[PDB]
Protein: Capsid protein VP1
Organism: Norwalk virus
Amino acid sequence: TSSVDGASGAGQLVPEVNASDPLAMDPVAGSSTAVATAGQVNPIDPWIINNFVQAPQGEFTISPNNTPGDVLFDLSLGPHLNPFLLHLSQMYNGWVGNMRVRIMLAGNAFTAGKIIVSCIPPGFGSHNLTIAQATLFPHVIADVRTLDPIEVPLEDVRNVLFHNNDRNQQTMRLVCMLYTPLRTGGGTGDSFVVAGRVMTCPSPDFNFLFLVPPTVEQKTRPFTLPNLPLSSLSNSRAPLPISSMGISPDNVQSVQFQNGRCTLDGRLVGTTPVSLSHVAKIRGTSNGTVINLTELDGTPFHPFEGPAPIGFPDLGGCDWHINMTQFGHSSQTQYDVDTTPDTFVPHLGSIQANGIGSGNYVGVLSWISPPSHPSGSQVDLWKIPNYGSSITEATHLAPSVYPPGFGEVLVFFMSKMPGPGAYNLPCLLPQEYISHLASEQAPTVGEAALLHYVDPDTGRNLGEFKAYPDGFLTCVPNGASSGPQQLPINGVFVFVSWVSRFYQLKPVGTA
Amino acid sequence: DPLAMDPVAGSSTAVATAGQVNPIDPWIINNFVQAPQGEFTISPNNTPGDVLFDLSLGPHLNPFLLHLSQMYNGWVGNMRVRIMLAGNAFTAGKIIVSCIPPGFGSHNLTIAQATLFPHVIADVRTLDPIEVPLEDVRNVLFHNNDRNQQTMRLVCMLYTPLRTGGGTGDSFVVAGRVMTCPSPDFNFLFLVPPTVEQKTRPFTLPNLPLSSLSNSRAPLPISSMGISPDNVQSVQFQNGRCTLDGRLVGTTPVSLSHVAKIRGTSNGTVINLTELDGTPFHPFEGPAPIGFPDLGGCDWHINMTQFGHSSQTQYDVDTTPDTFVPHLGSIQANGIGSGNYVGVLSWISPPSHPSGSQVDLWKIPNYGSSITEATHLAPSVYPPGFGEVLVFFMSKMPGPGAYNLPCLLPQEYISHLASEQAPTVGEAALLHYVDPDTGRNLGEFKAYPDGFLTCVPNGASSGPQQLPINGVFVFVSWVSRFYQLKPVGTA
Amino acid sequence: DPLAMDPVAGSSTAVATAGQVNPIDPWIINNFVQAPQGEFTISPNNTPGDVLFDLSLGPHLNPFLLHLSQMYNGWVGNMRVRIMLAGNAFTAGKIIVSCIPPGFGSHNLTIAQATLFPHVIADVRTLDPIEVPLEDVRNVLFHNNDRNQQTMRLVCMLYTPLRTGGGTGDSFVVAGRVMTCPSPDFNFLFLVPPTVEQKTRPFTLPNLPLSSLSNSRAPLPISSMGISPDNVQSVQFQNGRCTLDGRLVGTTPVSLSHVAKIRGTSNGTVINLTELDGTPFHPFEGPAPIGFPDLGGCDWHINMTQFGHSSQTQYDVDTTPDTFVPHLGSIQANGIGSGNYVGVLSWISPPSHPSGSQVDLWKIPNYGSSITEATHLAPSVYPPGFGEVLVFFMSKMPGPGAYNLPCLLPQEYISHLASEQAPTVGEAALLHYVDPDTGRNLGEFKAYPDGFLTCVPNGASSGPQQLPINGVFVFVSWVSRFYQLKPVGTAS
């Protein structure tokens, strides 16, 4: 067999088979409407047809922190629901046919709660539904204690004869919300979560359509991460190696960094470059008192393309000062920069020169110090510098990030910084991750990415993290002083599944 | 929902081209016995993706078949695996068992990737045992007694985590047992004179207590077991080096009468070193003559005698200058007369030259820094795995202070491994530390094919030092990289 | 005429002992698509008996089958090969394609001995392709995804010398193409998780423009491409070397945060060097600590800073004298104080010791003359083809002069190759330099499995210096070592 439920040792404390009315819908045809006017009709391997296999959106959680109405999962019809079909869809141009979904939900006999799954046709639109409106569609209601998995079909309601791997299509969705709140009985410990699984298989009427060169179309590319250990990577706000992982203090809950910001589909945001040869570097013409900044190759910087030139340093709460060299000249100059005054305006393309002679210089940041002007303060590296407070231009800063989930905090990659104290510089992503994501622009299918921190030689799992489409990681700390600082740095992040925003993580560390 | 595999043929494909086909005792066939690693535990601290166990196909799974394999030179056929879990009606959780074909490779997997093999998903409240076939997916007509053979393997991982109700505690674990039997298409192939083919020699250890054995770097009794300090993570010794196959590395002899002994011709300024039997030593075989003392940051000074003269001369040795070149076979002669002397190590001291430093026996001495010859030193060892540490056998050395000499393997173990030349099967050998009277298990260790032991300490000060020294090491099984040792010590 | 071979059975042999048998799509079966080893050349520089191409049977001879083999771990079956040549009426010559069975061994064959196999003889003047079947002569029941095992080979040789008449211009190359399709009895074996086995990964390069990448010998942005001076025909760089399989050689790190950096403790006289994390450097694992700078013919002086201290010092290094022994982990400390420091290269000057020479950045620095320990330098490279020269990626270096620093590969290429460890199927990689917004091909280059690039320049004044730097390198084909490239640049 392939599936053994524990009904022989369950004890008749749970329901075993879901009793429900069938879906109020008609059956939809498959590939037979495509035989006439499509170019080819391509069959799939018969070993893929009848084996249910964990979907790339395969895991979900039900918690007592969920309120009724929260979306547990949300699938769209297509070849990206099956991993074998996702590999095969890179070779083809379009598809028809239905799918078969199985939902696995086998909680404890001391639990209570119910879910509802609805089918929504194309053409309805993007709306946020209640649990009352979810009953106005064809729907199933299930209990969280059921021993057998629930099977739902996903039908291909169509205005046309077939589909293409493009943006000109909208298909049928399966939305699963929480219908009644999850409650437990007995002497419960509140590490209790119902863990649910989703498996899929194609129907026998599914087919692929037209053979194409198998890497070219960008829609069918799957999301990957580079297979490199963390100690061999670098910071994305300064050219420094990664030494640790960590959390911000409790008063800091949001972050608005400008360097090192890339979405999961591969868009660079802010003043973010592609390589480390541009990180924390300035290039400019010194007039004697004012340095006019350009791009690092010499192109004129326009004030509408960003808050600063690409690669401009964004260390906020410090007195950072750089090392300037010169093409065609034999010297090395130190350049002291204070961020606070009225003469520091990088969005208008001009900064100070407090002892830099006239000429054309290129500088890189070397080390930092506590800021001398405001109060005799300390180094606060969670802050961002003051750019140009403009009136005629729209300053296009990157937005702030904050953790969305239950008890989640942001995870930072820390690097040791030279200067007169013990300074740690945080970043949201390594730079090699940014280069991999910008090169491989896979579309994000879902609200978050579940990742595992894994020791590569043994295979042991050290932690469990969530990645978000804006390009940042969150986790749940285990206690008051526990967290990801206790993990070794020779590990590799491994992509596991596409999850929702309200997915709950197991906490990392020892309390 | 059947498994996504086809039936594999058994011994019928060997009837044409093997010489004989040999049947097995019918009391062995449909009889389930426990696997050599048929024990695992699910706790509520385990996460999905944690490898629970791993098995590979072959006659090493059954002890009757492993005894019978040393009488033949080939085998074919399938096996049957049976898994048993001990749970309640008040638990929840799931496991998955996948079938992985030969030629795939060693790669870590997720549970999503685990569902892409032929597999069984099972609940922890299952009352009946779970039955899996183990089929001989192969490229040839039959197997021979080799270890280049790659067979079909089973991996079992955790699918959904363990949740219990009621009086929720952390000490509730689910225990799991693995049993195996051979299928009626299993067969042995050709009758061979037994215990002659070296490919079927089983790995064994001598059945003697640890207190009655000896150090392999000096002729001293073993006193304790211990671990190195945290500043010492890599070690490079030259005596007491032997693989599990039985090959000596470095300057290692087979007998204790050659250990920490020199023999040399003295003219008054240099002592020209030979072998102890009288044959001249040549620099191209090794870093020193076989049996030379390999104590490092130390002023080790020896006792010299000779054949035919009533004499005991004390000889002082200094390994710092360029006068000390044992790689070219000529060392200091700082006051010994002319002739031929044999010397044994007797007494060590703190070193004289750098600062009058402390005795540190974790180091290797300076041998001859040559350019023209080959510096064939035995390489370093370092602990493999996650959280494992090297284990040393420690003896007491005479001198002015409390000196503990560490050792990698005892000399009687080296002689047993050199006499019984058995091949190593896989990555490490699991060992138990047993009381010889009660048979009670005291610890759990790993032996690696380069000839050392690792363990996992329980506390910041716990480990194999808290164990008695009258125990015996006992071989259990061959394990893979997925196996985690239980921590040893009283913590 | 048919070939002198019997029909070979397919997966009928594999039914009993394989776990599954999987069919493939019938639209792939009789569809002749260009192979990934699908390009070759014939030139008057070739002699009769030269190997034009060499193929082994398996799923990697077809791009659809190469994509599909990432979901399986075995195969069995036959294939069909088709060969096209593009010649003139002026070109005289014959080629021969021979089928060689597994277990024969490596021998130097004559053309007469090449006709003693099952073979096809073709004329270069033909306008029609030629058809050859490649059978699965097996000793076993099926195969796994492992190219170490021997299958049947197709070997193409030049049978008669290529001769041209009339106005002989030596740049008339005959182009040749190879196309493949599986037979109807080809089958895959066992469904497996996709793209997990590293033995079936195809070789790619990152889709990034060249001006956005960085140098491999110093942390500097790439500004141009170039060729070496004519007196320099070989180079021996130590930073920025990676096998196309993804192996790092020399003192090459994975990321740019380690490039041209030192770390060590000074006693006032000697700086003892350690690794950049703090672990001790051992003299046997390399020539130097990983990331040590390797700029040969100059006086490079670096910027040093300190953890927990508020200063910045300039450290002047001369790589000439006896104190500069980085292989034993010691350098001089002629003007800096005691303590632990971390330094990075910032600025170079002409070398001071020999007579007042000039900067020569084609040199590598004198690592210490240690014969007791073995100095494990990376080997030298040279162009192996007909009139090829090495290609370098060049960056501007600050100092008293117009200094350009060359390297063999960009650093992001090294990171991509070290992550994606694709096996090298063949002897050289034919690449194209493509204008990304128009799609127009700009040049044609060769990449070798020890990690360097070659081109053929169009004259004494031409080369890849006339090409723009916002292009992308795209992998095109696996070619042999004697593929003749088209000259790049405009004519002199």
Notes: Chain A touches chain C through 61 residues (CB under 8 Å). The radius of gyration of chain A is 27 Å. Residues 431-439 of chain A form the longest helix (9 residues).
